[PDB]
Amino acid sequence: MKDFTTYLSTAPVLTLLSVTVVAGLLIEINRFFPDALIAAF
Template sequence: MRDIKTYLSTAPVLTTLWFGSLAGLLIEINRLFPDALSFPFFSFLLNSFIDM
């Protein structure tokens, strides 16, 4: 059991899980909001930087 716990806590496994979940999140965001330029949060950030 200790060897399995050590294996699952290694950097390549954690990195694979992290990038896999990040890719899934980006896929779902692009599925819900197909055009990132019209995504309200990004346009809000862009407008706030322009107003500065």
């Protein structure tokens, strides 16, 4: 189990997971808050 978690912590796996999480978060932000041209607060 330790070796598996160590493999999941490698640079490529972590890079792909981080990019996927960031892309998913951005996609959902644009899905619920679309066409945000300016920062209207």
